Design a protein that fits this description.
This is part of a larger assembly, with two copies of chain A. The first copy, chain A, is an all-beta fold and about 50 residues long. Chain A has no helices and three strands. The termini of chain A are far apart. The chains hardly touch. The complex binds 2-acetamido-2-deoxy-beta-D-glucopyranose (NAG) (3 copies). The site of one 2-acetamido-2-deoxy-beta-D-glucopyranose (NAG) has 2 residues of chain B, from loops. One 2-acetamido-2-deoxy-beta-D-glucopyranose (NAG) binds next to loops of chain B. Chain A: This is Spike protein S1. Chain A: It comes from Severe acute respiratory syndrome coronavirus 2 (2019-nCoV). It is classed as viral protein.
């Protein structure tokens, strides 16, 4: 990101902070939320198998 | 004669001075 010298952080449209200027090293870092995904379970009937 | 166009001003200075203002001057 082309962060301008004054800019402290950026946001997702949900207000949740997308990226931050680190307070000890002036690097601009993205904050992605930790890895997730929906768990569909595919099964015969328990009448047939577990 | 102010030139027609668009350009976004960037914050360069923050003054935590708390001063009451209502008038001003320019220094040629
Ligand atoms: C434990 C249990 O419920 N087993 C039934 C079995 O008795 C029945 O004949 C079959 C029909 O397809 O479905 C299963
Ligand atoms: C925040 C503050 O102090 N504002 C004052 C305002 O009430 C007053 O009427 C004016 C007089 O010129 O000076 C300024
Ligand atoms: C904080 O400390 C480190 C180690 O001395 C230094 O390199 C860094 O520039 C300091 N950060 C700020 C914002 O002054």
């Amino acid at each position: 990101k082309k962060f301008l010298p004054f800019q402290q952080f950026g946001r997702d449209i949900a207000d949740t902070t997308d990226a931050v200027r680190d307070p000890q090293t002036l690097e601009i870092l993205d904050i992605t939320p930790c890895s997730f995904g929906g768990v569909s379970v595919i099964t015969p009937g328990t009448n047939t198998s577990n | 004669d102010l030139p027609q166009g668009f350009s976004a001003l960037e914050p360069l200075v923050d003054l935590p001075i708390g001063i009451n203002i209502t008038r001003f001057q320019t220094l040629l």
